[PDB]
């Protein structure tokens, strides 16, 4: 009487998770135009 540990695992598994790189700079650090 138990086997409910295999859905705690599972949420062991999509614990996962993060993304953000940012590359904003080039595109407004450059406009030098000049």
Same mark, same amino acid.
Not at 4 to 9: G, N, V
């Given at each position: $009487?138990? !086997? $409910? %540990?295999? !859905? &705690?695992?599972?949420? /062991?598994? #999509? &614990? *996962?998770?993060?993304? =953000? #790189? +940012? *590359? /904003? !700079?080039?595109? %407004? !650090?450059? +406009? =030098?135009?000049?």
């Amino acid at each position: $009487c138990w !086997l $409910c %540990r295999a !859905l &705690i695992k599972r949420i /062991q598994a #999509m &614990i *996962p998770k993060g993304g =953000r #790189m +940012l *590359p /904003q !700079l080039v595109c %407004r !650090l450059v +406009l =030098r135009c000049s």
